[PDB]
Amino acid sequence: ARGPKKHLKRLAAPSHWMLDKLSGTYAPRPSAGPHKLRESLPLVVFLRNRLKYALNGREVKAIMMQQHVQVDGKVRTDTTYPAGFMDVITLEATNEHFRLVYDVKGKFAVHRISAEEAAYKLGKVKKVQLGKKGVPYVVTHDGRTIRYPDPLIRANDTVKIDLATGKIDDFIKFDTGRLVMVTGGRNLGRVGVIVHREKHEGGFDLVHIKDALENTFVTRLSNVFVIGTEAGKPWVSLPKGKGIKLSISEERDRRRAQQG
Amino acid sequence: GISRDSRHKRSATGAKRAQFRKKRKFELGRQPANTKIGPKRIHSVRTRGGNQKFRALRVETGNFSWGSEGVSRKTRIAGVVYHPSNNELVRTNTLTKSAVVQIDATPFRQWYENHYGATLGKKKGGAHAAHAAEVADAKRSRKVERKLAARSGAAAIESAVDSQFGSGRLYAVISSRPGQSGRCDGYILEGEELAFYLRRLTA
Amino acid sequence: PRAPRTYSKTYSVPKRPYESARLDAELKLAGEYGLKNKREIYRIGFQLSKIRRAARDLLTRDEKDPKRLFEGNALIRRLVRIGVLSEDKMKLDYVLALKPEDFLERRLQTQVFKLGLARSIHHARVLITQRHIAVGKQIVNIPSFTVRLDSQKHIDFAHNSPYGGGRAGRVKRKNQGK
RNA sequence: CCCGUCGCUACUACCGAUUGAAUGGCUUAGUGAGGCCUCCGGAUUGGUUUAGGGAACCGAGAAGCUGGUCAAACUUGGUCAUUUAGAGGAAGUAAAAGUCGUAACAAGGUUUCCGUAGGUGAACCUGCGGAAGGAUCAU
RNA sequence: CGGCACCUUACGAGAAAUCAAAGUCUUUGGGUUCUGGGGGGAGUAUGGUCGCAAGGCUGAAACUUAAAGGAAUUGACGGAAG
RNA sequence: UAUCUGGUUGAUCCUGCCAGUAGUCAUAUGCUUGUCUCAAAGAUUAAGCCAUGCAUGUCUAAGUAUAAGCAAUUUAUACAGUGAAACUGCGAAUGGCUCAUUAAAUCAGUUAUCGUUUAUUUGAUAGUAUACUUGGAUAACCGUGGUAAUUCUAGAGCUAAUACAUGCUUAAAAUCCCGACUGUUUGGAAGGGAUGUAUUUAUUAGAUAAAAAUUUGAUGAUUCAUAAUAACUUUUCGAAUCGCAUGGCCUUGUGCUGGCGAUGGUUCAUUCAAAUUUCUGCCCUAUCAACUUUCGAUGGUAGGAUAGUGGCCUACCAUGGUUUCAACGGGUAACGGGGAAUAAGGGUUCGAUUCCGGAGAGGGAGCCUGAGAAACGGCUACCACAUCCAAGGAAGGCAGCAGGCGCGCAAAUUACCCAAUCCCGACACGGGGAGGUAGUGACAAUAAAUAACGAUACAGGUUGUAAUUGGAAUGAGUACAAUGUAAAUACCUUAACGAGGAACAAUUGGAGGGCAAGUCUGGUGCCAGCAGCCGCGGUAAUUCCAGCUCCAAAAGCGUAUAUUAAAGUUGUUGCAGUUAAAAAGCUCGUAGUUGAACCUUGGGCUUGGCUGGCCGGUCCUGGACCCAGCCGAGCCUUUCCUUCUGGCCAGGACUUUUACUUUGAAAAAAUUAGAGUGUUCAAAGCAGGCCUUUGCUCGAAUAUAUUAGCAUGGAAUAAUAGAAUAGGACGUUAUGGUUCU
């Protein structure tokens, strides 16, 4: 209606941001960027609601104006910059290196990684197509365009980005038994290995995955991200839980045992 | 102004639709260019997204092609001799897509003699014989005939197009849309596509 | 604008307005508990009925249902925590065996009476609203404050209360200073 | 116990001459603002710029103009819907049981009721054919 | 076999009279059509439709009212029988 | 809480309604009102009309500064700091309000764009065959002014850019076309043109069943991506731009080179969006049964227009399309949904309104700019109102914030502020009636005061009091102060003041029945009046008018209206139809609804899983064997269970359609249920808890959604199909023959 909206009501924000109902009327609207609005995280949310470094939305802005915040080794000056999956946030003033990866509970877990691990990332290949002058290229999940990839790279695969030169260090082929982290649905955050890919021509293909506790779930191919070539060897430091989804009773029993 | 929305229309059932909303800019229409033949007059139009359409009001020349032997040449366009949609488009010589026109054959005929060495039209009048002789008697190097010798034999084209060259005018069909692109291009009629167009033109 | 703040009622007036069988019973229950009005009975009645309603659904389920389990035990643990359900009555059937008298026995007003800090049950409510009794180290002046089992033993006079080692009140100071 | 004409009062609705009146929507036709496109046009204003005084010819180009297009608004007419007036007419209800009779309830003093057609101050009567919810389960 | 019915009984049903269906209906489900929602106003008005007409079919509202009615009991009454 | 009670009669059992009762995140109103948390609030009737003021502007080191601005002399006589005014750039298309129109429309869930536009963000992408850096205007500024009036502007004098218009700068070959001379059996070649990317044509790549006589990407699917060939273009752009350090090489010439960035820019991708669009689903009405189709209705062909598909429009040609499975028309006290009220269940009523989608800015209509508008806090025109006028003219749009009139049964202060949330800008700095805070507010909801305990005293069965006798406690309020806050008010803490009628006084209705609580006293005397209904009142009124007493609820209690339960009086669950209302006069009959039975059962064997024990092996708890049980399988039984290659997955070739049902994915947040968590409790909220932490640490679930669509396991139940003039099934490698790749 006459143009795009630039506002976001507090209740209209994505549920996984855990924004409180009575803080105010409006919520941070992510800008355009590498990740979709509903599947991303404004930087103002992260430095105020998770890390609690900033007590309000004003204090975060001064943080980024001192050039401390780096997304994937580059400075960002937009408080609402849409950080997303496998994104690396470095706050070298604190000497902290972050990687945004889902916990099993479906939300953005605070996952601290080593300084070396902050120098790469993994991206899901969206399409392989020939660009201008006969130059094939690859689009990753965050919209990165890498020219001259390995000619063996095809769709649904996961590549390793050097995160500095923008080139390809290695990639993981998509196949049976590949370690997978799910990034959508209510199976979001689960980690497992592919069992059988059922092809549905003209529709959505489903990926059958067995969890770490011999738990089987079926999810759409659009939510499937490869993180390791085989079981138990993820290319990134997986957060707490390792994508293992439990019962509510087990969580209560673990809660009962943990503090008492 | 002109709108392409289906709201003002009635449904497949035949029911009139109650007025939903006022007219919308993202679904407007515009006034036909009605391209004629004449001194070139083109008005650029601001369209959606900041893009530009080129309204051709009058054009004289266009890029016309031989698909059979792969030559495209820019040549004058005389006028429309047939339009499939409405026949008054012919009467007032309005240029749109798919119109059948006559264009001067000389820029094409020039390439034929340089490329193949023969002359088109095959007319047996005195002036045509003078043109026919001068082409084949022109000064060339030694190997030039040998290069033209290889192309000999395939230079013999279908009778209907060859007969046209005596009049110096070739039938053509406009391939572009003059009101959209600002050009009036086309290709030369050939084969059964041409012979089907000749059936009614001669009537 | 701002997201709505939800609210909900805590009581329900009975359908039949004047029934001396119910009219005397509510007087009898509140009279010996010193309850202020019938709303405090309508509150116990409504709040207890929904506890049964939660248990009623689970008993329709097949046993070992993890919702019947996880929800069933979670409800029971809360009830035993405040003492309304006996420690040997953890079967989800005794929850249906509850009565208004059980949880009113768990009130701050009731228990300060049975701990002897006030002579009468109405004097028990007076010690509460006049800010004299402290549970733990936090002063509570809510007559209806339900006392948990672990909070049962920590009810005593407030240290700044005149009856608990604090300074004299307004009346004593004015008279003793007159 | 009970029914109906007639009389009084009150209220509700209906029919009703007035080619009634008003309001609103839709729309035929007529006239038709304004914009937009288009066609010329060409106030002035720079020179593709060139010229022994300067003639040009190149570009931008305002008002205006021609034909179109979308079409506001009005006039006329038609239509649909909603309100509202009306002499008079003909009903219904209420009131209290005013006038005349006694139709029904008993075999209600001529058994009643149905359909239909005549008639009559009114209840109603009569014909013809039914029914028993009959005053007969029975010769 | 099919009928038109009749007598007794009530397993059962029903407010009862009664009912071999009016049973197999709070132990509520064979299929299916139609109809009613207190009494009047009223099968009236209006519109439509069928009919030569008489009329048929469809069919309100305003207003008004605490009752109208069904089966049976006792009594009272009868220009009914014994 | 799955509830009934009064009213037809002399009395009875029914049918049936009236009345009673309770709630309403439901309105108004009456009476009354002490506290704390929280908190709706001109929607209803008029999308009726508006006085006043505000509601969108914005500058960094990185666009343009000779303000005749300020300030100091400074690394500076091209400028250098700050910085009004303007040009340029971006935004003003969000936000906020209202719900008039609107009934396959909006909307919902779910699809597609191989049919499209997309500022911004984010990555990628450009050596293309005067240059030491080009021109001419122009604002602000200056000063001649005119109109009464306005965010009206007219001459004149300057001057500037990421504004306006132009314009070279660069590799190496290589290829193609033309091609004089020449070799003379077909080559060599001097000399010319074309090479990047944008536009538009046309033509070619864009391959893939395994042995015998060199490449080629994507898709389920393409004329797809890309490339090339021949050209075409009122020829797109391959930077004449801004800030800081100032380095390195010496051939010491203002020599050659260069780090971090601003801004810009072609195309691609991505992202914030947009626009269409697939399927299934919307209240009442048949006293709406046929509608659409000249002049677009249904389709086709071609074209135009569009960003693009498409009768969106035009020309020509057919006569189509919708409909009793309810089209079309009418009403709507109709924006839709998430949701709300009530509810044992099934349901009924409501949804203007804190979120999402849509529409509108008095009623239409048409456009400028812009990526984005048919925009109204943009314009133009008309209609209707309407403001000033000097009478010539000029200016309007609160269904934004507060506020004023009207209408009504019906609804707040012309307060403060960007501190919190977020948005916009040139952006660490400005703006924001967005948003937040306060004022009014018995819309609702939470918690919760008006007392307590003794001693006498009679009565009284070890104590429950009833009167006259006390000493305490405390907040209602009042206030230092501190906290609270952008600054305040308030809350909480708190010195001092603050209770005997603790006048610091609790009210709202009633007392015949329903329905709780009098046959007490006085007044009236069928009158006044009460009475939801039945009735009470005609001189002892249990019912009016008064007092006393008592009852129900309590800071709350009646009245009116609507609606839900009651109502099994709308009945799918779940009504009734002989006589109470109600079986069509009777047959035929169409759509519809419903339709006899019947097709692999049984047996046998082996095996996996969890219940009870026996084992007990007991810290309730865990093992084979044993008993059964309850499921899952795997084989043989004449055997369904697709079939081959690579070799239970991955690559192929085939399949009667379903209906139904398991599970999965989905069904936004809020709301509901519900986990955990002592907001002092609670309503809430998603916080929090830790021996007091230069930090450690559970969380912030999980259910319900339900129709449509997707996937999946099963084959009873209900259909659907096959082999009768055999045009039937197999020959896997059956024989040939016909052709195609």
PDB file of all heavy atoms in Angstrom, chain D residues 33 35 70 72-73, chain F residues 363 366 381-382:
ATOM      1  P     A D  33     -16.114  21.600 -21.511  1.00  0.00           P
ATOM      2  OP1   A D  33     -15.691  22.587 -22.533  1.00  0.00           O
ATOM      3  OP2   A D  33     -15.874  20.157 -21.750  1.00  0.00           O
ATOM      4  O5'   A D  33     -15.400  22.005 -20.146  1.00  0.00           O
ATOM      5  C5'   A D  33     -15.666  23.257 -19.529  1.00  0.00           C
ATOM      6  C4'   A D  33     -15.309  23.241 -18.063  1.00  0.00           C
ATOM      7  O4'   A D  33     -16.082  22.224 -17.379  1.00  0.00           O
ATOM      8  C3'   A D  33     -13.862  22.905 -17.736  1.00  0.00           C
ATOM      9  O3'   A D  33     -13.018  24.040 -17.819  1.00  0.00           O
ATOM     10  C2'   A D  33     -13.954  22.336 -16.326  1.00  0.00           C
ATOM     11  O2'   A D  33     -13.998  23.380 -15.366  1.00  0.00           O
ATOM     12  C1'   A D  33     -15.315  21.637 -16.354  1.00  0.00           C
ATOM     13  N9    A D  33     -15.195  20.197 -16.634  1.00  0.00           N
ATOM     14  C8    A D  33     -15.720  19.524 -17.703  1.00  0.00           C
ATOM     15  N7    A D  33     -15.457  18.243 -17.700  1.00  0.00           N
ATOM     16  C5    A D  33     -14.711  18.063 -16.549  1.00  0.00           C
ATOM     17  C6    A D  33     -14.126  16.923 -15.979  1.00  0.00           C
ATOM     18  N6    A D  33     -14.214  15.708 -16.517  1.00  0.00           N
ATOM     19  N1    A D  33     -13.446  17.076 -14.823  1.00  0.00           N
ATOM     20  C2    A D  33     -13.367  18.299 -14.287  1.00  0.00           C
ATOM     21  N3    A D  33     -13.874  19.446 -14.731  1.00  0.00           N
ATOM     22  C4    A D  33     -14.544  19.257 -15.878  1.00  0.00           C
ATOM     23  P     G D  35      -6.429  21.904 -17.425  1.00  0.00           P
ATOM     24  OP1   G D  35      -5.542  23.030 -17.055  1.00  0.00           O
ATOM     25  OP2   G D  35      -7.201  21.952 -18.690  1.00  0.00           O
ATOM     26  O5'   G D  35      -5.533  20.590 -17.435  1.00  0.00           O
ATOM     27  C5'   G D  35      -4.781  20.226 -16.289  1.00  0.00           C
ATOM     28  C4'   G D  35      -4.929  18.760 -15.981  1.00  0.00           C
ATOM     29  O4'   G D  35      -6.317  18.366 -16.110  1.00  0.00           O
ATOM     30  C3'   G D  35      -4.192  17.811 -16.907  1.00  0.00           C
ATOM     31  O3'   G D  35      -2.821  17.699 -16.578  1.00  0.00           O
ATOM     32  C2'   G D  35      -4.969  16.511 -16.744  1.00  0.00           C
ATOM     33  O2'   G D  35      -4.566  15.828 -15.567  1.00  0.00           O
ATOM     34  C1'   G D  35      -6.397  17.025 -16.540  1.00  0.00           C
ATOM     35  N9    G D  35      -7.230  16.954 -17.760  1.00  0.00           N
ATOM     36  C8    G D  35      -7.973  17.976 -18.292  1.00  0.00           C
ATOM     37  N7    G D  35      -8.637  17.640 -19.358  1.00  0.00           N
ATOM     38  C5    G D  35      -8.320  16.306 -19.544  1.00  0.00           C
ATOM     39  C6    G D  35      -8.748  15.408 -20.545  1.00  0.00           C
ATOM     40  O6    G D  35      -9.507  15.624 -21.494  1.00  0.00           O
ATOM     41  N1    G D  35      -8.199  14.148 -20.367  1.00  0.00           N
ATOM     42  C2    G D  35      -7.343  13.800 -19.355  1.00  0.00           C
ATOM     43  N2    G D  35      -6.917  12.531 -19.346  1.00  0.00           N
ATOM     44  N3    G D  35      -6.942  14.629 -18.413  1.00  0.00           N
ATOM     45  C4    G D  35      -7.466  15.860 -18.563  1.00  0.00           C
ATOM     46  P     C D  70     -12.319   6.840 -22.648  1.00  0.00           P
ATOM     47  OP1   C D  70     -12.666   5.402 -22.575  1.00  0.00           O
ATOM     48  OP2   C D  70     -13.256   7.804 -23.273  1.00  0.00           O
ATOM     49  O5'   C D  70     -12.010   7.344 -21.174  1.00  0.00           O
ATOM     50  C5'   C D  70     -11.058   6.670 -20.369  1.00  0.00           C
ATOM     51  C4'   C D  70     -10.758   7.446 -19.117  1.00  0.00           C
ATOM     52  O4'   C D  70     -10.038   8.658 -19.456  1.00  0.00           O
ATOM     53  C3'   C D  70     -11.964   7.946 -18.346  1.00  0.00           C
ATOM     54  O3'   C D  70     -12.561   6.956 -17.533  1.00  0.00           O
ATOM     55  C2'   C D  70     -11.383   9.108 -17.563  1.00  0.00           C
ATOM     56  O2'   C D  70     -10.618   8.622 -16.474  1.00  0.00           O
ATOM     57  C1'   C D  70     -10.425   9.701 -18.589  1.00  0.00           C
ATOM     58  N1    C D  70     -11.058  10.772 -19.391  1.00  0.00           N
ATOM     59  C2    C D  70     -11.030  12.073 -18.896  1.00  0.00           C
ATOM     60  O2    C D  70     -10.486  12.273 -17.806  1.00  0.00           O
ATOM     61  N3    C D  70     -11.599  13.067 -19.609  1.00  0.00           N
ATOM     62  C4    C D  70     -12.174  12.799 -20.777  1.00  0.00           C
ATOM     63  N4    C D  70     -12.723  13.806 -21.453  1.00  0.00           N
ATOM     64  C5    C D  70     -12.216  11.482 -21.310  1.00  0.00           C
ATOM     65  C6    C D  70     -11.652  10.510 -20.591  1.00  0.00           C
ATOM     66  P     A D  72     -17.839  11.150 -14.111  1.00  0.00           P
ATOM     67  OP1   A D  72     -18.081   9.867 -13.410  1.00  0.00           O
ATOM     68  OP2   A D  72     -18.574  11.450 -15.364  1.00  0.00           O
ATOM     69  O5'   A D  72     -18.090  12.333 -13.076  1.00  0.00           O
ATOM     70  C5'   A D  72     -17.328  12.407 -11.883  1.00  0.00           C
ATOM     71  C4'   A D  72     -16.868  13.811 -11.586  1.00  0.00           C
ATOM     72  O4'   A D  72     -16.201  14.384 -12.738  1.00  0.00           O
ATOM     73  C3'   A D  72     -17.954  14.816 -11.252  1.00  0.00           C
ATOM     74  O3'   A D  72     -18.382  14.716  -9.905  1.00  0.00           O
ATOM     75  C2'   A D  72     -17.284  16.145 -11.568  1.00  0.00           C
ATOM     76  O2'   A D  72     -16.420  16.534 -10.512  1.00  0.00           O
ATOM     77  C1'   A D  72     -16.425  15.777 -12.778  1.00  0.00           C
ATOM     78  N9    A D  72     -17.082  16.112 -14.053  1.00  0.00           N
ATOM     79  C8    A D  72     -17.234  15.282 -15.129  1.00  0.00           C
ATOM     80  N7    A D  72     -17.855  15.837 -16.136  1.00  0.00           N
ATOM     81  C5    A D  72     -18.124  17.121 -15.698  1.00  0.00           C
ATOM     82  C6    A D  72     -18.766  18.206 -16.312  1.00  0.00           C
ATOM     83  N6    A D  72     -19.270  18.161 -17.543  1.00  0.00           N
ATOM     84  N1    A D  72     -18.879  19.352 -15.615  1.00  0.00           N
ATOM     85  C2    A D  72     -18.371  19.390 -14.383  1.00  0.00           C
ATOM     86  N3    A D  72     -17.747  18.437 -13.699  1.00  0.00           N
ATOM     87  C4    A D  72     -17.651  17.310 -14.418  1.00  0.00           C
ATOM     88  P     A D  73     -19.906  14.361  -9.555  1.00  0.00           P
ATOM     89  OP1   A D  73     -20.032  14.390  -8.080  1.00  0.00           O
ATOM     90  OP2   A D  73     -20.284  13.140 -10.303  1.00  0.00           O
ATOM     91  O5'   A D  73     -20.728  15.595 -10.126  1.00  0.00           O
ATOM     92  C5'   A D  73     -20.529  16.889  -9.590  1.00  0.00           C
ATOM     93  C4'   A D  73     -21.120  17.965 -10.464  1.00  0.00           C
ATOM     94  O4'   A D  73     -20.396  18.053 -11.715  1.00  0.00           O
ATOM     95  C3'   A D  73     -22.566  17.787 -10.889  1.00  0.00           C
ATOM     96  O3'   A D  73     -23.485  18.151  -9.877  1.00  0.00           O
ATOM     97  C2'   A D  73     -22.654  18.671 -12.124  1.00  0.00           C
ATOM     98  O2'   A D  73     -22.802  20.034 -11.758  1.00  0.00           O
ATOM     99  C1'   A D  73     -21.267  18.480 -12.739  1.00  0.00           C
ATOM    100  N9    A D  73     -21.280  17.470 -13.810  1.00  0.00           N
ATOM    101  C8    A D  73     -20.755  16.205 -13.800  1.00  0.00           C
ATOM    102  N7    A D  73     -20.941  15.553 -14.917  1.00  0.00           N
ATOM    103  C5    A D  73     -21.633  16.452 -15.714  1.00  0.00           C
ATOM    104  C6    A D  73     -22.130  16.371 -17.022  1.00  0.00           C
ATOM    105  N6    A D  73     -21.998  15.291 -17.790  1.00  0.00           N
ATOM    106  N1    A D  73     -22.775  17.444 -17.520  1.00  0.00           N
ATOM    107  C2    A D  73     -22.906  18.526 -16.747  1.00  0.00           C
ATOM    108  N3    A D  73     -22.483  18.725 -15.504  1.00  0.00           N
ATOM    109  C4    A D  73     -21.848  17.636 -15.043  1.00  0.00           C
TER     110        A D  73
ATOM    111  P     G F 363     -15.509  11.549   1.079  1.00  0.00           P
ATOM    112  OP1   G F 363     -15.622  10.138   1.516  1.00  0.00           O
ATOM    113  OP2   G F 363     -14.200  12.079   0.625  1.00  0.00           O
ATOM    114  O5'   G F 363     -16.570  11.793  -0.078  1.00  0.00           O
ATOM    115  C5'   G F 363     -17.956  11.565   0.126  1.00  0.00           C
ATOM    116  C4'   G F 363     -18.709  11.735  -1.165  1.00  0.00           C
ATOM    117  O4'   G F 363     -18.800  13.144  -1.484  1.00  0.00           O
ATOM    118  C3'   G F 363     -18.029  11.109  -2.370  1.00  0.00           C
ATOM    119  O3'   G F 363     -18.362   9.743  -2.517  1.00  0.00           O
ATOM    120  C2'   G F 363     -18.490  11.980  -3.528  1.00  0.00           C
ATOM    121  O2'   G F 363     -19.793  11.597  -3.940  1.00  0.00           O
ATOM    122  C1'   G F 363     -18.594  13.348  -2.864  1.00  0.00           C
ATOM    123  N9    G F 363     -17.410  14.222  -3.023  1.00  0.00           N
ATOM    124  C8    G F 363     -16.424  14.408  -2.087  1.00  0.00           C
ATOM    125  N7    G F 363     -15.524  15.280  -2.438  1.00  0.00           N
ATOM    126  C5    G F 363     -15.947  15.724  -3.678  1.00  0.00           C
ATOM    127  C6    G F 363     -15.366  16.679  -4.550  1.00  0.00           C
ATOM    128  O6    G F 363     -14.334  17.340  -4.394  1.00  0.00           O
ATOM    129  N1    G F 363     -16.114  16.834  -5.705  1.00  0.00           N
ATOM    130  C2    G F 363     -17.270  16.155  -5.984  1.00  0.00           C
ATOM    131  N2    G F 363     -17.869  16.427  -7.148  1.00  0.00           N
ATOM    132  N3    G F 363     -17.819  15.265  -5.179  1.00  0.00           N
ATOM    133  C4    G F 363     -17.113  15.095  -4.048  1.00  0.00           C
ATOM    134  P     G F 366     -10.289   8.902 -13.278  1.00  0.00           P
ATOM    135  OP1   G F 366     -10.360   7.931 -14.395  1.00  0.00           O
ATOM    136  OP2   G F 366      -9.951   8.419 -11.919  1.00  0.00           O
ATOM    137  O5'   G F 366      -9.251  10.051 -13.655  1.00  0.00           O
ATOM    138  C5'   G F 366      -9.447  10.879 -14.793  1.00  0.00           C
ATOM    139  C4'   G F 366      -8.441  12.001 -14.846  1.00  0.00           C
ATOM    140  O4'   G F 366      -8.715  12.984 -13.820  1.00  0.00           O
ATOM    141  C3'   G F 366      -7.002  11.603 -14.595  1.00  0.00           C
ATOM    142  O3'   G F 366      -6.402  11.033 -15.739  1.00  0.00           O
ATOM    143  C2'   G F 366      -6.364  12.915 -14.164  1.00  0.00           C
ATOM    144  O2'   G F 366      -6.067  13.717 -15.294  1.00  0.00           O
ATOM    145  C1'   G F 366      -7.506  13.573 -13.392  1.00  0.00           C
ATOM    146  N9    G F 366      -7.383  13.405 -11.932  1.00  0.00           N
ATOM    147  C8    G F 366      -7.981  12.447 -11.155  1.00  0.00           C
ATOM    148  N7    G F 366      -7.694  12.563  -9.890  1.00  0.00           N
ATOM    149  C5    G F 366      -6.859  13.665  -9.827  1.00  0.00           C
ATOM    150  C6    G F 366      -6.226  14.273  -8.715  1.00  0.00           C
ATOM    151  O6    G F 366      -6.283  13.946  -7.527  1.00  0.00           O
ATOM    152  N1    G F 366      -5.466  15.367  -9.090  1.00  0.00           N
ATOM    153  C2    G F 366      -5.328  15.823 -10.370  1.00  0.00           C
ATOM    154  N2    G F 366      -4.554  16.896 -10.545  1.00  0.00           N
ATOM    155  N3    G F 366      -5.909  15.266 -11.417  1.00  0.00           N
ATOM    156  C4    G F 366      -6.656  14.198 -11.076  1.00  0.00           C
ATOM    157  P     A F 381      -8.412  24.921 -10.386  1.00  0.00           P
ATOM    158  OP1   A F 381      -8.536  26.219 -11.086  1.00  0.00           O
ATOM    159  OP2   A F 381      -8.406  24.882  -8.905  1.00  0.00           O
ATOM    160  O5'   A F 381      -9.586  23.990 -10.912  1.00  0.00           O
ATOM    161  C5'   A F 381      -9.825  23.861 -12.302  1.00  0.00           C
ATOM    162  C4'   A F 381     -10.996  22.956 -12.574  1.00  0.00           C
ATOM    163  O4'   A F 381     -10.607  21.576 -12.373  1.00  0.00           O
ATOM    164  C3'   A F 381     -12.202  23.133 -11.671  1.00  0.00           C
ATOM    165  O3'   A F 381     -13.023  24.217 -12.064  1.00  0.00           O
ATOM    166  C2'   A F 381     -12.896  21.785 -11.776  1.00  0.00           C
ATOM    167  O2'   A F 381     -13.644  21.707 -12.979  1.00  0.00           O
ATOM    168  C1'   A F 381     -11.706  20.834 -11.891  1.00  0.00           C
ATOM    169  N9    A F 381     -11.329  20.214 -10.606  1.00  0.00           N
ATOM    170  C8    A F 381     -10.368  20.635  -9.724  1.00  0.00           C
ATOM    171  N7    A F 381     -10.244  19.863  -8.674  1.00  0.00           N
ATOM    172  C5    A F 381     -11.182  18.864  -8.883  1.00  0.00           C
ATOM    173  C6    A F 381     -11.548  17.738  -8.130  1.00  0.00           C
ATOM    174  N6    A F 381     -10.988  17.425  -6.965  1.00  0.00           N
ATOM    175  N1    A F 381     -12.516  16.937  -8.613  1.00  0.00           N
ATOM    176  C2    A F 381     -13.080  17.256  -9.780  1.00  0.00           C
ATOM    177  N3    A F 381     -12.822  18.286 -10.579  1.00  0.00           N
ATOM    178  C4    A F 381     -11.854  19.062 -10.069  1.00  0.00           C
ATOM    179  P     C F 382     -14.029  24.885 -11.010  1.00  0.00           P
ATOM    180  OP1   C F 382     -14.562  26.141 -11.589  1.00  0.00           O
ATOM    181  OP2   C F 382     -13.340  24.909  -9.698  1.00  0.00           O
ATOM    182  O5'   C F 382     -15.233  23.851 -10.917  1.00  0.00           O
ATOM    183  C5'   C F 382     -16.062  23.588 -12.039  1.00  0.00           C
ATOM    184  C4'   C F 382     -16.933  22.383 -11.800  1.00  0.00           C
ATOM    185  O4'   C F 382     -16.097  21.231 -11.533  1.00  0.00           O
ATOM    186  C3'   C F 382     -17.857  22.461 -10.596  1.00  0.00           C
ATOM    187  O3'   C F 382     -19.059  23.151 -10.886  1.00  0.00           O
ATOM    188  C2'   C F 382     -18.077  20.998 -10.238  1.00  0.00           C
ATOM    189  O2'   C F 382     -19.068  20.426 -11.076  1.00  0.00           O
ATOM    190  C1'   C F 382     -16.729  20.379 -10.604  1.00  0.00           C
ATOM    191  N1    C F 382     -15.827  20.180  -9.445  1.00  0.00           N
ATOM    192  C2    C F 382     -15.994  19.037  -8.670  1.00  0.00           C
ATOM    193  O2    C F 382     -16.906  18.257  -8.968  1.00  0.00           O
ATOM    194  N3    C F 382     -15.179  18.808  -7.622  1.00  0.00           N
ATOM    195  C4    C F 382     -14.211  19.674  -7.344  1.00  0.00           C
ATOM    196  N4    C F 382     -13.430  19.411  -6.299  1.00  0.00           N
ATOM    197  C5    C F 382     -14.002  20.845  -8.120  1.00  0.00           C
ATOM    198  C6    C F 382     -14.824  21.055  -9.152  1.00  0.00           C
TER     199        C F 382
END
